[PDB]
């Protein structure tokens, strides 16, 4: 039919453009004209064929507008190519913005256009009108309606972020995403924020005549000096692009934090924990007191926010560079430790503990609590330097919490104390041997400070209740913990 | 087989925690507590009780009405009339006071009672300060203040009689022989719970024989 006639036309066009590109300059316009037809089958076919032809003809460089025989051949061919590519992008925009719903005969033109756009992003980022291409991608990743096309465009942007080695495409994509989120007032679905996490820039004797030999020598020295200059300018340009992208990313993170979007704080804190070592130093301190201010605002849902910020601070300080910076930078986590200590009881009586590769963005408050307690009691660095008073106070309060929390959370806490006693031992054995109980002072449960509560003046009595707890799992947890206590 | 059975009861009250469905939660918590008393198994329920306390109905000032006290032996749901009523507020406060009473008298001798109760005391004191910074229900206020005072007294009592017990991790004869020789009326919380058992009984036969005279008068 007309469909087969169109297929023959497109086949001729594509074959001619693959074989001899220069000799055929107007067949881009021929594709546009044949795609102008109003029947859906030929529109799908022409869009796919245009995808293929631009994919295999776009050069590895951009071209300048001429403005103002072989040379004129190339100029005409390149001008036709860019005009055609602009036309293809406009048509892709219109079809992608066109209404998806139709009668069911396969993938609609909307999904086909989205696939074409994703392939263009993945294949030709360097070429012109990357702005229009990425604008279509962002207009799709700005709707809060998870779809197959939505996940395709997320995958395309993630692939671009993890494959960009120069940085300009990544910069422009980040700028578009940032402006989109600011315009939508941060009503996005946290996937566009995880894209920032996925960013990569933030991580045979051929005879030669006498004449030829001297030339190839000359271009040898020329390419040597060019490689040197190229390396230096590449370093400088990468640094500048990284600076700009970091500026935009941290700006959007800080604005989301200041707006307190309930469903994005985890992702924002993960990004902060990931990139605070790549941002400056006084700014690292500023983020520490920013987390302090978030804790205080939550003090004046809320429990999860406070635990998220505590995990963020502890991970930030658990980074290697921050750990070596500690003394010089005055990075003290005493506030976070005391806040966790004072909030343990409220979290223990909270009824929503279990109402739920990431290291910060964790969906369950008890998981957050184990991350906090692991960072405090069992830090990766200076594990044999932890204050015994801190260890004992947290052990006592954690036994009380294990008494007063749901079964699986209790089993988690009990295993954490099992590991704590295995690791430290003699520092806390006095908490179970009553004849080593200290006699200087009385235990103060409702204390404001960990040291204020004298932890070595009390004994762990919670076993006589947790042993008759109804959960066999927590029962063998106590059995193993007491076994380690006896095998010290 | 108690474990599976409990799991289901926890899930049953956690399916939806709504003030409409408080009575069902109260009934299943009573079931769990009576199971705990007959067996020797610990059932965490202070979380559920503190939830119903820091739920919506028991904080905002109530609404004036004139209805009949809900019979918390025949309810699966609460009528739309009882949404903000002082009658409903008093009924739920009395039920909470009761359930806490059986819980904390039911575990009134374990050598870790203060370690088991202290979170409940601090939560109740926080709620009391919040509501006297709420409603105006002085009846519930006084009932909870006397409850928390008696809980603190029982915890202290455990302090003095446990201060002289040896509990090395390889020798626990004294803690295994701690308090078998004392009965559930000597403890201050035992006296508390038996006294309000007597008070609950007097109110119950009050209402029962009373409704009998109204029935006879109507007849």
């Amino acid at each position: 039919e007309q469909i087969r006639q169109a297929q023959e036309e497109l086949a001729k066009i594509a074959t001619q453009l693959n074989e001899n590109p220069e000799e055929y300059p107007g067949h881009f316009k021929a594709l546009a004209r044949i795609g102008e037809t109003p029947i859906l089958a030929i529109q799908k076919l022409c869009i796919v064929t245009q995808m293929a032809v631009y994919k295999d003809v776009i050069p590895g460089y951009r071209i300048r507008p001429l403005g103002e025989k072989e040379v004129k051949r190339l100029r005409t061919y390149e001008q036709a190519l860019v005009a055609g590519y602009h036309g293809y992008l406009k048509t892709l925009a219109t079809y992608a913005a066109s209404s998806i719903p139709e009668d069911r005969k396969g993938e609609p033109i909307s999904s086909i256009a989205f696939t074409c756009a994703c392939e263009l992003v993945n294949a030709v980022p360097h070429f012109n009108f990357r702005g229009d291409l990425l604008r279509i991608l962002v207009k799709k990743l700005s709707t809060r309606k998870i779809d197959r096309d939505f996940v395709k465009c997320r995958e395309a942007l993630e692939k671009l972020f993890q494959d960009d080695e120069e940085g300009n495409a990544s910069q422009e994509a980040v700028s578009l995403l940032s402006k989109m989120m600011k315009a939508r007032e941060y009503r996005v679905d946290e996937s566009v924020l995880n894209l920032f996490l996925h960013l990569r820039l933030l991580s045979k004797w051929e005879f030669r005549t006498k004449k030829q030999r001297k030339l190839l020598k000359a271009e040898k020295e020329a390419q040597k000096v060019m490689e040197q200059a190229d390396a230096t300018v590449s370093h400088e340009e990468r640094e500048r692009i990284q600076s700009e992208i970091l500026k935009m990313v941290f700006a959007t993170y800080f604005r989301i934090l200041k707006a307190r979007v309930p469903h994005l704080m985890g992702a924002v804190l993960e990004g902060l924990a990931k990139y605070a070592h790549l941002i400056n130093q006084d700014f690292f301190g500023d983020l520490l007191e920013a987390l302090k201010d978030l804790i205080r605002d939550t003090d004046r849902d809320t429990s999860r926010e406070s635990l998220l910020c505590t995990v963020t601070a502890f991970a930030l300080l658990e980074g290697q560079d921050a750990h070596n910076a500690r003394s010089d930078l005055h990075l003290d986590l005493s506030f976070f430790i005391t806040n966790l200590y004072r909030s343990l009881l409220s979290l223990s009586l909270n009824p929503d503990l279990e109402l739920g590769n990431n290291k910060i963005n964790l969906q369950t408050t008890t998981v957050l609590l184990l991350r906090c307690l692991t960072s405090v009691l069992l830090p990766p660095w200076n594990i044999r330097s932890v204050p015994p008073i801190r260890l004992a106070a947290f052990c006592k309060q954690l036994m009380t919490l294990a008494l007063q929390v749901p079964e699986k959370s209790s089993q988690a806490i009990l295993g954490l104390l099992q590991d704590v006693v295995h690791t430290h031992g003699r520092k806390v054995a006095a908490l179970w041997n009553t004849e080593e109980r200290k006699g200087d002072g009385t235990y103060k449960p409702l204390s404001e400070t960990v040291e204020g509560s004298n932890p070595f003046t009390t004994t762990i009595w919670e076993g006589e209740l947790l042993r008759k707890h109804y959960c066999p799992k927590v029962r063998e947890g106590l059995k193993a913990m007491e076994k380690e206590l006896r095998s010290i | 087989l108690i474990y599976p059975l409990v799991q289901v009861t926890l899930g049953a009250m956690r399916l939806i925690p709504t003030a409409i469905y408080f009575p069902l939660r109260f009934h299943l918590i009573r079931s769990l507590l009576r199971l705990s008393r007959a067996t020797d198994t610990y059932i965490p329920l202070a979380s559920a009780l503190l939830e119903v306390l820091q739920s919506a109905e028991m904080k905002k000032p109530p609404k004036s009405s004139t209805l009949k006290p809900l019979d918390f032996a025949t309810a699966y749901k609460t009528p739309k009339s009882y949404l903000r009523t002082r009658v409903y507020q008093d009924g739920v406060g009395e039920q909470v006071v009761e359930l806490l009473s059986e819980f904390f008298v039911l575990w009134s001798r374990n050598i870790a009672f203060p370690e088991f109760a202290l979170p409940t005391i601090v939560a109740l004191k926080r709620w009391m300060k919040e509501m006297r910074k709420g409603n105006k229900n002085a009846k519930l206020g006084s009932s909870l203040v006397v409850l928390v005072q008696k809980l603190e007294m029982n915890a202290k009592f455990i302090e003095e009689r446990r201060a002289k017990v040896d509990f090395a991790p390889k020798d626990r004869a004294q803690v295994d022989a701690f308090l078998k020789d004392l009965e559930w009326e000597k403890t201050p919380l035992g006296a508390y719970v038996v006294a309000q058992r007597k008070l609950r009984e007097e109110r119950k036969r009050l209402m029962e024989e009373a409704r009998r005279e109204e029935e006879r008068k109507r007849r």
Binding site: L370, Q418, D419 | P4, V8
Partner: peptide, 20 residues
């Protein structure tokens, strides 16, 4: 070790131990 094995987010599903 064990603490990490429980701090895995997949350990708090809520499956009843009668569907073994």
């Amino acid at each position: 070790n064990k603490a990490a094995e429980m701090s895995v987010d997949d350990f708090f599903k809520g499956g009843f131990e009668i569907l073994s």
